[PDB]
Symmetry: C2
Subunit: 139 residues, 2 copies
Amino acid sequence: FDAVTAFADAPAAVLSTLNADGAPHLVPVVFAVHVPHVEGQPARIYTAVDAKRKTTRNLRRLANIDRDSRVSLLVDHYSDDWTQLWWVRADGVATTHHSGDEVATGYALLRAKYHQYERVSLDGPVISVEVSRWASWQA
Amino acid sequence: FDAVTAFADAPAAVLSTLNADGAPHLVPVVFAVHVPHVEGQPARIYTAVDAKRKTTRNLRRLANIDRDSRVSLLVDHYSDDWTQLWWVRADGVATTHHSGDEVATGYALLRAKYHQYERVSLDGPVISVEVSRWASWQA
Ligand SMILES: [Cl-]
Ligand code: NA
């Protein structure tokens, strides 16, 4: 069982950020993982946001990250057979990018993973999560 | 939409608690919801922690809740058809019970929901979450 691979291959993760008063917030995301092949460098998790400025929403995860960059993401596998349960969690620091190489990198990885991005537009900011630790569990 | 029923029927949710340094901690749980048949009263979400065996992960989670009762739980539904995505979130205040009526109430609801508890033991503390707000989204 490779935790990083199991996480990377999954379609959806839950992203947790901190609200202004410190309480946790949760939203699901689609995402792509970059495993740096210079081995010994931290993994990167990329996720795009469908948010326009001044006249729209989905603003909360961005506003949370801007105030406090500490985040966690979890991929879970449920089964009716509880001996088949597992999960993988990434804890890390999120940076929001509105231009540059990170946006390019994020867009690239996201399109490669999700074919839905052939029809669904991809013109919002990209969150880059530097993973400080991976955790996992199997039943 | 009906968000509460959708949440209540789902097999698994992601529970977010706060670590000692205030950063989010995430773990998936099985859970059961009590919706009061009286108007005004908040819903309660119940989830059990095993005490057949003590584990570092479970002591961490219990300590987080003891330290700060603020939690969030999310049920999400992924589909490769992104027009069918949805999620439901409960924000609330968690109390851990090691005996008493909350444990009885939680055990009863959990056994009613999960047939797996016919084989899996249920003799640990029960986390009872008083829901302060529900949120939901549909694609
Ligand atoms: Cl929201
Ligand atoms: Na909300």
